[PDB]
Each structure stands twice: as structure tokens, then as C-alpha cells.
Design a protein that fits this description.
109 residues, mainly beta, OB fold (Dihydrolipoamide Acetyltransferase, E2P), six-stranded antiparallel β-sheet, two-stranded antiparallel sheet, 1 helix, tRNA-bd_dom, NA-bd_OB-fold, ATP binding, Methionine--tRNA ligase, ATP-binding
């Protein structure tokens, strides 16, 4: 069922990012706004896992983020990337933190 080429995967850019701050977006039940430090730059990233993962479980940690996607506004918030996580078929979401040793900005691929 559809097999792709590695170079095609390689065009997407995932990097390690440190969550400087994370807070629920007003008037939403699942949205969380993140301010992520990728070393050379900072980015605002929205994730909608607040019904399963509270904001304080992301702050201070490093995670994988796709950073070369088309910008998108959620509830008026400009999201400049996307938090990568694990999710089972039953809809349960799990964070995938990056080890503390990995420098922010490292490429994930």
C-alpha cells in the first residue's frame, strides 16, 4: 500500500525543540500554544492534546517538531510547526520527549 522514496521523506524537516512556554488557548478544550526554542530561532506551535496532556507536562522539555510546513492559524493563533507524538488506534496520545542531551535545533530524520 503506497511506498515512497527516502528523498521524498527527507524534504520534510523535523528538529529538536525546547518548549519554553505552554498554555491552553482561550475558549478551547484541546488547544495548547507553545513557544519553542530551536536554537537559532523561536517558533509558535499549536498542538491539540490538552484533553489528554496538560500544558505543564510539555514546558521545560524537548520534543520533535516538523518545522517546514505551511503556516496555519488555529483559533486566531499562527502555528509555525507541529509537535510530533505517538498515538494508538484507540485515540490515546503519548508524548515522545527527546533526551535532554540532544542540542536544540538538531535534525530528526
Amino acid at each position: 500500500m503506497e511506498l515512497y522514496d527516502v528523498d521524498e521523506f527527507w524534504k520534510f524537516q523535523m528538529k529538536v525543540g525546547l518548549v519554553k512556554k505552554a498554555e491552553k488557548i482561550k475558549r478551547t478544550k484541546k488547544l495548547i500554544k507553545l513557544i519553542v526554542d530551536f536554537g537559532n530561532e523561536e517558533r509558535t506551535i499549536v498542538t491539540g492534546i490538552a484533553d489528554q496532556i496538560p500544558p505543564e507536562e510539555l514546558e521545560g522539555k524537548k520534543f520533535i517538531f516538523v518545522v517546514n510546513l505551511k503556516p496555519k492559524k488555529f483559533s486566531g493563533v499562527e502555528s509555525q510547526g507541529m509537535l510530533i507524538l505517538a498515538e494508538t488506534e484507540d485515540g490515546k496520545v503519548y508524548l515522545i520527549p527527546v533526551p535532554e542531551e540532544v542540542p536544540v535545533g538538531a535534525r530528526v530524520w
